[PDB]
Homo-oligomer: A and B are copies of this chain.
Amino acid sequence: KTRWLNPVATFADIATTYPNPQHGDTVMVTDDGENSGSVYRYENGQWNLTQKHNDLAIADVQNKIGILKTIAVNVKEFGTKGDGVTDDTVAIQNAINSIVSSLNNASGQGGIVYFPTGTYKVTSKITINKSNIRLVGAGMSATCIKSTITNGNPVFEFVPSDTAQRLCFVGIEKMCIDGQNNDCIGVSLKKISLGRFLDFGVRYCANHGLYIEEVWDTNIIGLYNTDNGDLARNKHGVYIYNGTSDNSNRLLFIACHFEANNGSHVYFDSTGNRRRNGNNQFIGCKFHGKDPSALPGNNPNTPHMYLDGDVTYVMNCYFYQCNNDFIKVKGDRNKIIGCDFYNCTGYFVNLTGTSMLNVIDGCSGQYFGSGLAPFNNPTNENFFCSDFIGENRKLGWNRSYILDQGGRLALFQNVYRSGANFIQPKGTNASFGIQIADNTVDGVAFVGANASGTDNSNVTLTTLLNVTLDGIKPKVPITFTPVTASSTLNNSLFVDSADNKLKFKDNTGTVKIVTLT
Protein backbone atom coordinates (compact mmCIF):
# COMPACT_ATOMS: atom_id res chain seq x y z
CA LYS A 1 0.00 0.00 0.00
CA THR A 2 1.38 3.37 -1.14
CA ARG A 3 -0.19 6.61 0.12
CA TRP A 4 1.39 9.74 -1.33
CA LEU A 5 1.76 12.70 0.99
CA ASN A 6 2.35 16.23 -0.15
CA PRO A 7 6.09 16.81 -0.73
CA VAL A 8 8.28 18.72 1.72
CA ALA A 9 11.43 20.78 1.19
CA THR A 10 13.92 18.85 3.34
CA PHE A 11 14.08 15.53 5.17
CA ALA A 12 14.41 17.60 8.36
CA ASP A 13 10.95 18.97 7.57
CA ILE A 14 9.40 15.47 7.51
CA ALA A 15 9.21 15.03 11.29
CA THR A 16 8.11 18.65 11.85
CA THR A 17 5.47 18.68 9.12
CA TYR A 18 4.41 15.04 9.76
CA PRO A 19 4.79 14.29 13.50
CA ASN A 20 2.21 11.42 13.50
CA PRO A 21 3.09 9.17 10.56
CA GLN A 22 1.19 6.06 9.48
CA HIS A 23 2.19 2.93 7.57
CA GLY A 24 2.49 3.21 3.79
CA ASP A 25 3.08 6.97 3.97
CA THR A 26 5.27 8.16 1.07
CA VAL A 27 6.76 11.64 0.63
CA MET A 28 9.36 13.16 -1.71
CA VAL A 29 11.85 15.79 -0.59
CA THR A 30 12.07 18.51 -3.23
CA ASP A 31 14.44 21.26 -1.97
CA ASP A 32 17.05 19.34 0.04
CA GLY A 33 20.22 20.40 -1.74
CA GLU A 34 21.97 17.44 -3.34
CA ASN A 35 19.42 15.08 -1.74
CA SER A 36 16.50 16.57 -3.72
CA GLY A 37 14.25 14.06 -5.47
CA SER A 38 14.69 11.43 -2.77
CA VAL A 39 11.53 9.56 -1.79
CA TYR A 40 11.08 8.34 1.79
CA ARG A 41 8.52 5.91 3.17
CA TYR A 42 7.30 5.46 6.74
CA GLU A 43 7.90 1.80 7.59
CA ASN A 44 7.99 -0.05 10.92
CA GLY A 45 8.22 3.25 12.82
CA GLN A 46 10.91 4.80 10.60
CA TRP A 47 11.06 6.73 7.33
CA ASN A 48 12.79 4.55 4.72
CA LEU A 49 14.44 5.42 1.41
CA THR A 50 12.73 3.71 -1.53
CA GLN A 51 13.73 3.22 -5.16
CA LYS A 52 10.13 2.34 -6.14
CA HIS A 53 8.90 5.76 -7.33
CA ASN A 54 11.35 6.69 -10.10
CA ASP A 55 8.84 8.16 -12.56
CA LEU A 56 10.56 11.54 -12.24
CA ALA A 57 14.05 11.86 -13.71
CA ILE A 58 15.34 13.49 -10.52
CA ALA A 59 14.13 10.56 -8.42
CA ASP A 60 15.62 8.03 -10.81
CA VAL A 61 18.91 9.99 -10.83
CA GLN A 62 19.09 9.87 -7.02
CA ASN A 63 18.61 6.08 -7.05
CA LYS A 64 21.36 5.64 -9.64
CA ILE A 65 23.74 7.99 -7.80
CA GLY A 66 23.17 5.99 -4.64
CA ILE A 67 24.23 2.81 -6.43
CA LEU A 68 27.25 4.46 -8.08
CA LYS A 69 28.40 5.75 -4.69
CA THR A 70 28.80 2.16 -3.41
CA ILE A 71 32.07 1.76 -5.36
CA ALA A 72 34.11 3.87 -2.94
CA VAL A 73 34.13 6.64 -0.35
CA ASN A 74 35.68 9.58 -2.17
CA VAL A 75 37.72 11.81 0.15
CA LYS A 76 36.44 14.75 -1.90
CA GLU A 77 33.00 14.11 -0.36
CA PHE A 78 34.52 15.12 2.97
CA GLY A 79 36.16 18.36 1.88
CA THR A 80 39.65 17.57 0.53
CA LYS A 81 41.10 20.14 -1.84
CA GLY A 82 44.03 18.01 -3.03
CA ASP A 83 45.93 21.19 -3.93
CA GLY A 84 49.01 20.72 -1.73
CA VAL A 85 48.20 24.00 0.04
CA THR A 86 45.08 23.35 2.12
CA ASP A 87 45.49 21.05 5.12
CA ASP A 88 43.52 17.96 4.08
CA THR A 89 44.18 15.90 7.25
CA VAL A 90 40.77 16.27 8.87
CA ALA A 91 38.82 15.57 5.69
CA ILE A 92 40.78 12.36 4.98
CA GLN A 93 40.36 11.13 8.57
CA ASN A 94 36.63 11.86 8.35
CA ALA A 95 36.26 9.92 5.09
CA ILE A 96 38.04 6.93 6.64
CA ASN A 97 35.96 7.11 9.82
CA SER A 98 32.74 7.16 7.78
CA ILE A 99 33.10 3.50 6.79
CA VAL A 100 31.32 1.29 9.32
CA SER A 101 33.52 -1.67 10.21
CA SER A 102 34.99 -3.63 13.11
CA LEU A 103 38.05 -5.71 13.99
CA ASN A 104 39.21 -9.19 12.83
CA ASN A 105 37.36 -10.68 9.81
CA ALA A 106 34.44 -8.20 9.98
CA SER A 107 32.78 -9.98 7.08
CA GLY A 108 30.43 -7.86 5.00
CA GLN A 109 31.85 -4.55 6.33
CA GLY A 110 34.45 -2.15 4.95
CA GLY A 111 35.37 -0.73 1.57
CA ILE A 112 37.60 1.61 -0.42
CA VAL A 113 38.59 5.14 0.53
CA TYR A 114 39.43 6.71 -2.85
CA PHE A 115 41.88 9.60 -3.27
CA PRO A 116 41.53 11.28 -6.67
CA THR A 117 44.51 12.75 -8.51
CA GLY A 118 46.11 15.43 -6.40
CA THR A 119 48.58 16.48 -3.74
CA TYR A 120 47.22 16.03 -0.19
CA LYS A 121 48.93 18.00 2.58
CA VAL A 122 48.84 16.01 5.84
CA THR A 123 49.93 17.59 9.12
CA SER A 124 49.13 14.94 11.73
CA LYS A 125 48.87 11.16 11.90
CA ILE A 126 46.01 9.56 10.00
CA THR A 127 44.74 6.38 11.68
CA ILE A 128 42.99 3.35 10.18
CA ASN A 129 41.64 1.28 13.09
CA LYS A 130 39.10 -1.12 11.51
CA SER A 131 39.28 -4.09 9.16
CA ASN A 132 38.65 -4.20 5.40
CA ILE A 133 39.70 -0.58 4.68
CA ARG A 134 41.74 -0.01 1.52
CA LEU A 135 43.22 3.39 0.65
CA VAL A 136 43.24 3.65 -3.16
CA GLY A 137 44.64 6.51 -5.21
CA ALA A 138 44.76 7.43 -8.87
CA GLY A 139 48.35 6.26 -9.42
CA MET A 140 51.67 5.71 -7.66
CA SER A 141 52.50 9.38 -8.29
CA ALA A 142 49.18 10.86 -9.53
CA THR A 143 47.97 10.71 -5.92
CA CYS A 144 50.61 12.03 -3.52
CA ILE A 145 50.35 12.51 0.25
CA LYS A 146 52.70 15.32 1.33
CA SER A 147 53.58 15.15 5.02
CA THR A 148 54.61 18.00 7.32
CA ILE A 149 54.74 15.67 10.34
CA THR A 150 57.96 16.16 12.34
CA ASN A 151 57.27 14.33 15.64
CA GLY A 152 58.18 10.86 14.37
CA ASN A 153 54.59 9.74 13.88
CA PRO A 154 53.39 7.94 10.75
CA VAL A 155 51.37 9.52 7.99
CA PHE A 156 49.08 6.49 7.80
CA GLU A 157 48.93 4.31 10.92
CA PHE A 158 47.13 0.96 10.58
CA VAL A 159 46.52 -0.61 14.01
CA PRO A 160 43.49 -2.21 15.72
CA SER A 161 41.66 -0.01 18.22
CA ASP A 162 41.83 -3.01 20.58
CA THR A 163 45.37 -4.39 20.34
CA ALA A 164 44.44 -7.74 21.76
CA GLN A 165 42.71 -8.10 18.37
CA ARG A 166 43.85 -7.65 14.77
CA LEU A 167 43.00 -5.73 11.63
CA CYS A 168 42.39 -7.89 8.59
CA PHE A 169 42.48 -7.14 4.85
CA VAL A 170 43.69 -3.55 4.92
CA GLY A 171 45.89 -2.12 2.22
CA ILE A 172 47.14 0.76 0.11
CA GLU A 173 47.02 0.89 -3.68
CA LYS A 174 48.17 3.37 -6.32
CA MET A 175 49.45 6.34 -4.31
CA CYS A 176 52.65 7.91 -2.93
CA ILE A 177 53.51 9.04 0.59
CA ASP A 178 56.17 11.78 0.50
CA GLY A 179 57.76 12.65 3.84
CA GLN A 180 59.50 15.76 2.43
CA ASN A 181 62.57 14.80 4.55
CA ASN A 182 60.60 15.48 7.76
CA ASP A 183 60.87 13.25 10.84
CA CYS A 184 57.82 11.08 10.12
CA ILE A 185 57.14 7.44 9.31
CA GLY A 186 55.59 6.89 5.89
CA VAL A 187 53.27 3.96 6.67
CA SER A 188 52.98 2.09 9.97
CA LEU A 189 51.44 -1.40 10.07
CA LYS A 190 50.80 -3.12 13.40
CA LYS A 191 48.87 -6.29 14.26
CA ILE A 192 47.63 -6.71 10.68
CA SER A 193 46.63 -9.99 9.01
CA LEU A 194 45.99 -10.61 5.30
CA GLY A 195 46.94 -7.15 4.10
CA ARG A 196 47.01 -6.50 0.34
CA PHE A 197 49.23 -3.65 -0.99
CA LEU A 198 49.85 -2.84 -4.66
CA ASP A 199 52.00 -0.27 -6.48
CA PHE A 200 52.47 2.37 -3.83
CA GLY A 201 55.39 4.61 -2.99
CA VAL A 202 56.99 5.70 0.28
CA ARG A 203 59.74 8.27 -0.15
CA TYR A 204 61.73 10.98 1.65
CA CYS A 205 60.73 9.97 5.19
CA ALA A 206 63.49 10.74 7.68
CA ASN A 207 62.05 8.16 10.13
CA HIS A 208 61.21 4.60 8.98
CA GLY A 209 59.79 4.51 5.49
CA LEU A 210 57.53 1.52 6.17
CA TYR A 211 57.33 0.33 9.78
CA ILE A 212 55.93 -3.15 10.35
CA GLU A 213 55.28 -4.77 13.74
CA GLU A 214 53.63 -8.19 14.22
CA VAL A 215 52.09 -8.34 10.74
CA TRP A 216 50.99 -11.68 9.26
CA ASP A 217 50.15 -13.00 5.81
CA THR A 218 50.46 -9.75 3.87
CA ASN A 219 51.24 -9.31 0.18
CA ILE A 220 53.12 -6.19 -0.94
CA ILE A 221 53.40 -5.97 -4.73
CA GLY A 222 55.35 -3.26 -6.55
CA LEU A 223 56.38 -1.10 -3.60
CA TYR A 224 58.67 1.83 -4.49
CA ASN A 225 60.76 2.78 -1.47
CA THR A 226 63.47 5.47 -1.63
CA ASP A 227 65.29 8.15 0.37
CA ASN A 228 63.98 6.87 3.71
CA GLY A 229 65.52 6.37 7.10
CA ASP A 230 68.24 7.85 9.27
CA LEU A 231 71.20 5.58 9.99
CA ALA A 232 72.39 7.42 13.11
CA ARG A 233 68.93 7.04 14.70
CA ASN A 234 68.45 3.46 13.44
CA LYS A 235 65.61 4.24 11.00
CA HIS A 236 65.41 2.28 7.77
CA GLY A 237 63.48 2.00 4.51
CA VAL A 238 61.47 -0.99 5.76
CA TYR A 239 61.70 -1.98 9.43
CA ILE A 240 60.18 -5.32 10.38
CA TYR A 241 59.82 -5.93 14.13
CA ASN A 242 58.37 -8.97 15.87
CA GLY A 243 56.97 -7.02 18.81
CA THR A 244 56.57 -8.26 22.34
CA SER A 245 54.15 -11.19 22.04
CA ASP A 246 54.33 -12.83 18.56
CA ASN A 247 56.16 -12.13 15.28
CA SER A 248 55.92 -10.84 11.72
CA ASN A 249 55.59 -13.71 9.25
CA ARG A 250 54.47 -14.29 5.64
CA LEU A 251 55.27 -10.77 4.49
CA LEU A 252 55.63 -11.22 0.74
CA PHE A 253 57.39 -8.40 -1.14
CA ILE A 254 57.03 -9.05 -4.87
CA ALA A 255 58.71 -6.96 -7.58
CA CYS A 256 59.54 -4.18 -5.13
CA HIS A 257 62.04 -1.38 -5.74
CA PHE A 258 64.32 -0.19 -2.91
CA GLU A 259 66.73 2.58 -3.84
CA ALA A 260 69.03 5.14 -2.22
CA ASN A 261 67.75 4.79 1.31
CA ASN A 262 69.60 6.47 4.15
CA GLY A 263 69.28 3.47 6.44
CA SER A 264 69.17 -0.12 5.29
CA HIS A 265 66.60 -0.93 2.64
CA VAL A 266 65.20 -3.78 4.77
CA TYR A 267 65.90 -4.24 8.46
CA PHE A 268 64.56 -7.25 10.40
CA ASP A 269 64.43 -6.88 14.19
CA SER A 270 63.62 -10.05 16.19
CA THR A 271 64.64 -8.73 19.63
CA GLY A 272 61.10 -8.10 20.89
CA ASN A 273 60.55 -11.61 22.26
CA ARG A 274 61.62 -15.19 21.68
CA ARG A 275 59.35 -15.69 18.65
CA ARG A 276 61.59 -14.56 15.78
CA ASN A 277 60.43 -13.13 12.48
CA GLY A 278 59.97 -15.93 9.97
CA ASN A 279 58.80 -17.00 6.53
CA ASN A 280 58.99 -13.61 4.86
CA GLN A 281 59.86 -13.41 1.14
CA PHE A 282 61.40 -11.00 -1.37
CA ILE A 283 60.73 -12.06 -4.97
CA GLY A 284 62.27 -10.11 -7.85
CA CYS A 285 63.19 -7.16 -5.67
CA LYS A 286 65.80 -4.46 -6.39
CA PHE A 287 68.24 -3.23 -3.71
CA HIS A 288 70.09 -0.27 -5.22
CA GLY A 289 72.53 1.91 -3.32
CA LYS A 290 72.65 5.68 -2.89
CA ASP A 291 75.84 6.81 -4.69
CA PRO A 292 77.05 5.04 -7.86
CA SER A 293 80.15 7.28 -8.18
CA ALA A 294 82.30 5.42 -5.65
CA LEU A 295 82.44 2.95 -2.81
CA PRO A 296 82.27 3.93 0.05
CA GLY A 297 81.44 7.25 -1.60
CA ASN A 298 78.30 8.73 -0.09
CA ASN A 299 76.78 5.28 0.55
CA PRO A 300 75.73 4.69 4.18
CA ASN A 301 77.63 2.11 6.22
CA THR A 302 74.73 -0.31 6.61
CA PRO A 303 73.74 -3.59 4.89
CA HIS A 304 71.22 -3.48 2.06
CA MET A 305 69.28 -6.11 4.04
CA TYR A 306 69.80 -6.83 7.72
CA LEU A 307 68.23 -10.24 8.28
CA ASP A 308 67.62 -10.92 11.99
CA GLY A 309 65.08 -13.55 11.03
CA ASP A 310 64.55 -17.17 10.07
CA VAL A 311 63.29 -18.91 6.94
CA THR A 312 63.43 -15.78 4.76
CA TYR A 313 63.18 -16.35 1.01
CA VAL A 314 65.31 -13.99 -1.10
CA MET A 315 64.44 -15.09 -4.64
CA ASN A 316 65.95 -13.61 -7.83
CA CYS A 317 66.73 -10.30 -6.16
CA TYR A 318 69.17 -7.70 -7.48
CA PHE A 319 71.76 -6.10 -5.20
CA TYR A 320 73.94 -3.16 -6.27
CA GLN A 321 76.37 -0.75 -4.58
CA CYS A 322 76.56 -1.24 -0.80
CA ASN A 323 78.97 0.15 1.79
CA ASN A 324 78.57 -2.98 4.00
CA ASP A 325 77.46 -6.57 3.42
CA PHE A 326 74.65 -6.86 0.90
CA ILE A 327 72.84 -9.31 3.22
CA LYS A 328 73.91 -9.48 6.87
CA VAL A 329 72.31 -12.65 8.27
CA LYS A 330 71.52 -13.41 11.93
CA GLY A 331 69.26 -16.44 11.75
CA ASP A 332 68.55 -19.85 10.29
CA ARG A 333 67.33 -21.54 7.10
CA ASN A 334 67.23 -18.37 5.04
CA LYS A 335 67.27 -18.93 1.30
CA ILE A 336 69.28 -16.82 -1.14
CA ILE A 337 68.42 -18.26 -4.55
CA GLY A 338 69.25 -16.84 -7.97
CA CYS A 339 70.38 -13.46 -6.72
CA ASP A 340 73.02 -11.23 -8.30
CA PHE A 341 75.38 -9.06 -6.27
CA TYR A 342 77.47 -6.20 -7.72
CA ASN A 343 79.95 -4.08 -5.71
CA CYS A 344 79.95 -3.99 -1.89
CA THR A 345 82.58 -3.37 0.76
CA GLY A 346 81.77 -6.52 2.75
CA TYR A 347 80.43 -9.97 1.86
CA PHE A 348 77.56 -10.61 -0.50
CA VAL A 349 76.09 -12.82 2.26
CA ASN A 350 77.52 -12.53 5.79
CA LEU A 351 76.38 -15.47 7.95
CA THR A 352 76.95 -14.02 11.42
CA GLY A 353 77.06 -15.67 14.84
CA THR A 354 75.39 -19.09 15.02
CA SER A 355 73.47 -18.70 11.70
CA MET A 356 72.88 -22.17 10.33
CA LEU A 357 71.35 -24.07 7.39
CA ASN A 358 71.14 -20.96 5.23
CA VAL A 359 71.56 -21.66 1.53
CA ILE A 360 73.11 -19.64 -1.32
CA ASP A 361 71.94 -21.29 -4.52
CA GLY A 362 72.16 -20.32 -8.19
CA CYS A 363 73.61 -16.92 -7.30
CA SER A 364 76.35 -14.87 -8.95
CA GLY A 365 77.97 -11.47 -8.85
CA GLN A 366 81.18 -9.48 -8.80
CA TYR A 367 83.23 -7.19 -6.53
CA PHE A 368 82.81 -8.27 -2.92
CA GLY A 369 85.03 -6.53 -0.37
CA SER A 370 88.76 -6.48 -1.09
CA GLY A 371 90.47 -9.54 0.37
CA LEU A 372 87.11 -11.08 1.34
CA ALA A 373 84.73 -13.42 -0.50
CA PRO A 374 81.09 -13.76 -1.65
CA PHE A 375 80.31 -15.30 1.75
CA ASN A 376 82.19 -15.68 5.02
CA ASN A 377 83.41 -18.86 6.72
CA PRO A 378 80.67 -19.19 9.34
CA THR A 379 80.71 -20.84 12.75
CA ASN A 380 77.98 -23.37 11.89
CA GLU A 381 77.02 -25.39 8.82
CA ASN A 382 75.53 -23.49 5.86
CA PHE A 383 75.10 -24.64 2.27
CA PHE A 384 76.00 -23.14 -1.09
CA CYS A 385 75.82 -24.10 -4.78
CA SER A 386 76.79 -21.05 -6.87
CA ASP A 387 79.43 -19.69 -9.22
CA PHE A 388 80.66 -16.18 -8.34
CA ILE A 389 83.43 -14.26 -10.04
CA GLY A 390 86.54 -14.51 -7.86
CA GLU A 391 85.37 -17.54 -5.86
CA ASN A 392 86.82 -21.00 -6.52
CA ARG A 393 84.33 -22.83 -4.30
CA LYS A 394 81.29 -23.94 -6.29
CA LEU A 395 79.40 -26.29 -3.96
CA GLY A 396 79.90 -27.02 -0.31
CA TRP A 397 78.67 -27.03 3.24
CA ASN A 398 80.51 -26.24 6.43
CA ARG A 399 84.16 -26.94 5.48
CA SER A 400 83.55 -29.54 2.72
CA TYR A 401 84.08 -28.13 -0.78
CA ILE A 402 83.82 -28.92 -4.45
CA LEU A 403 85.95 -26.22 -6.06
CA ASP A 404 88.09 -25.06 -8.96
CA GLN A 405 91.73 -25.62 -7.97
CA GLY A 406 93.72 -23.82 -10.65
CA GLY A 407 91.77 -25.46 -13.46
CA ARG A 408 91.48 -28.82 -11.66
CA LEU A 409 88.30 -30.39 -10.33
CA ALA A 410 88.89 -30.50 -6.57
CA LEU A 411 87.21 -32.21 -3.60
CA PHE A 412 88.70 -30.59 -0.50
CA GLN A 413 88.10 -30.94 3.25
CA ASN A 414 89.08 -27.98 5.45
CA VAL A 415 90.99 -26.13 2.72
CA TYR A 416 90.21 -24.04 -0.35
CA ARG A 417 92.09 -21.91 -2.84
CA SER A 418 91.72 -18.12 -2.57
CA GLY A 419 93.88 -16.23 -5.02
CA ALA A 420 97.22 -18.01 -4.92
CA ASN A 421 96.85 -19.25 -1.36
CA PHE A 422 95.18 -22.23 0.27
CA ILE A 423 93.02 -21.18 3.20
CA GLN A 424 92.37 -23.45 6.19
CA PRO A 425 89.06 -22.40 7.80
CA LYS A 426 89.48 -24.52 10.97
CA GLY A 427 93.09 -24.03 12.11
CA THR A 428 93.04 -26.77 14.77
CA ASN A 429 92.38 -29.45 12.10
CA ALA A 430 94.35 -30.90 9.19
CA SER A 431 93.35 -30.53 5.53
CA PHE A 432 93.00 -33.19 2.82
CA GLY A 433 91.85 -33.25 -0.78
CA ILE A 434 91.75 -34.80 -4.23
CA GLN A 435 92.33 -32.68 -7.37
CA ILE A 436 91.81 -33.99 -10.89
CA ALA A 437 93.84 -32.22 -13.59
CA ASP A 438 93.79 -32.39 -17.39
CA ASN A 439 97.54 -32.65 -17.86
CA THR A 440 99.56 -35.88 -17.76
CA VAL A 441 102.10 -34.69 -15.17
CA ASP A 442 99.46 -34.15 -12.45
CA GLY A 443 96.77 -36.72 -13.37
CA VAL A 444 94.69 -37.45 -10.25
CA ALA A 445 96.49 -36.08 -7.20
CA PHE A 446 96.03 -36.37 -3.45
CA VAL A 447 97.05 -33.49 -1.17
CA GLY A 448 97.16 -32.75 2.54
CA ALA A 449 98.43 -30.30 5.13
CA ASN A 450 98.79 -30.23 8.91
CA ALA A 451 96.78 -27.98 11.20
CA SER A 452 98.06 -24.42 10.79
CA GLY A 453 97.02 -23.39 14.32
CA THR A 454 94.85 -20.43 13.22
CA ASP A 455 91.38 -20.26 11.66
CA ASN A 456 91.44 -18.82 8.12
CA SER A 457 95.23 -18.83 7.94
CA ASN A 458 96.98 -20.33 4.92
CA VAL A 459 98.65 -23.71 4.35
CA THR A 460 101.09 -25.29 1.91
CA LEU A 461 99.57 -28.38 0.28
CA THR A 462 101.78 -31.48 0.17
CA THR A 463 101.23 -33.81 -2.78
CA LEU A 464 100.97 -37.35 -1.36
CA LEU A 465 100.13 -39.39 -4.46
CA ASN A 466 99.64 -38.96 -8.20
CA VAL A 467 97.77 -41.37 -10.47
CA THR A 468 98.82 -40.82 -14.10
CA LEU A 469 98.90 -42.64 -17.44
CA ASP A 470 102.37 -44.09 -16.83
CA GLY A 471 102.37 -44.73 -13.08
CA ILE A 472 100.93 -44.84 -9.59
CA LYS A 473 103.32 -42.37 -7.95
CA PRO A 474 103.48 -42.39 -4.12
CA LYS A 475 105.30 -39.44 -2.55
CA VAL A 476 105.12 -41.13 0.86
CA PRO A 477 105.78 -44.83 1.66
CA ILE A 478 103.40 -47.70 1.06
CA THR A 479 102.47 -48.86 4.57
CA PHE A 480 100.72 -52.26 4.69
CA THR A 481 98.18 -53.39 7.23
CA PRO A 482 98.64 -57.15 7.74
CA VAL A 483 96.03 -59.45 6.16
CA THR A 484 95.55 -63.23 5.96
CA ALA A 485 97.26 -65.03 3.08
CA SER A 486 94.07 -66.88 2.07
CA SER A 487 92.27 -63.56 1.48
CA THR A 488 94.84 -62.45 -1.15
CA LEU A 489 94.49 -62.61 -4.95
CA ASN A 490 97.08 -63.91 -7.40
CA ASN A 491 99.94 -61.45 -7.98
CA SER A 492 99.43 -59.77 -4.57
CA LEU A 493 101.97 -58.03 -2.37
CA PHE A 494 100.89 -57.96 1.30
CA VAL A 495 102.08 -58.38 4.89
CA ASP A 496 100.88 -61.72 6.30
CA SER A 497 99.07 -61.32 9.61
CA ALA A 498 100.13 -64.86 10.64
CA ASP A 499 103.83 -63.98 10.95
CA ASN A 500 104.04 -60.27 10.03
CA LYS A 501 106.30 -60.95 7.05
CA LEU A 502 106.19 -59.21 3.66
CA LYS A 503 104.99 -61.80 1.16
CA PHE A 504 104.02 -62.12 -2.50
CA LYS A 505 101.35 -64.51 -3.82
CA ASP A 506 102.46 -65.11 -7.42
CA ASN A 507 100.41 -65.75 -10.56
CA THR A 508 100.00 -69.45 -9.65
CA GLY A 509 98.51 -68.70 -6.24
CA THR A 510 101.64 -69.71 -4.28
CA VAL A 511 102.54 -67.53 -1.30
CA LYS A 512 106.25 -66.70 -1.26
CA ILE A 513 108.32 -64.67 1.21
CA VAL A 514 110.05 -61.53 -0.03
CA THR A 515 113.75 -61.98 0.74
CA LEU A 516 115.07 -59.18 2.96
CA THR A 517 118.67 -58.43 3.83
Contacts and interface: CB of A to CB of B under 8 A. Distances in A.
A432 interface: yes
B50 A6 contact: yes
Chain A interface residue count: which class? 35 or more
Given A429-B438, A476-B472, A57 B41 contact: no
Contact of A411 (B6, B67, B432, B436): B436
A51 B61 contact: no
A169 B194 contact: no
A139 B134 contact: yes
A56 interface: yes
A57 B28 contact: yes
A88 to B, nearest CB: 12
Interface stretch (A229-237, A252-260, A371-379): A252-260
A90 interface: no
B196 A168 contact: no
B436 A142 contact: no
Interface in A445-490: 446, 448-451, 462, 464-465, 467-483, 487-490
A33 B8 CA distance: 18
Given A60-B4, A71-B114, A142 B36 contact: no
8 contacts: A2-B55, A4-B50, A7-B52, A55-B58, A108-B117, A141-B194, A479-B492, A515-B517
A362 interface: yes
Interface centre among A117, A252, A357, A440 (most CB of B within 10 A): A117
Interface in A495-517: 495, 500-502, 504-507, 512-517
Given A28-B57, A397-B394, A476 B469 contact: yes
A337 interface: yes
A386 interface: yes
A52, A68, A426 — which one has the most chain B CB atoms within 10 A of its CB? A52
Contacts of A17: none
Contacts of A478: 471-474, 478, 492-494
A357 B411 contact: no
A77 interface: yes
Interface string A96-111: 0000010001111111
Interface stretch (A154-162, A276-284, A292-300, A347-355): A276-284
Contacts of A492: 471, 477-480
A76 interface: yes
Contacts of A52: 7, 28, 30
A316 interface: yes
Given A110-B141, A142-B109, A465-B472, A37 B50 contact: no
A243 interface: no
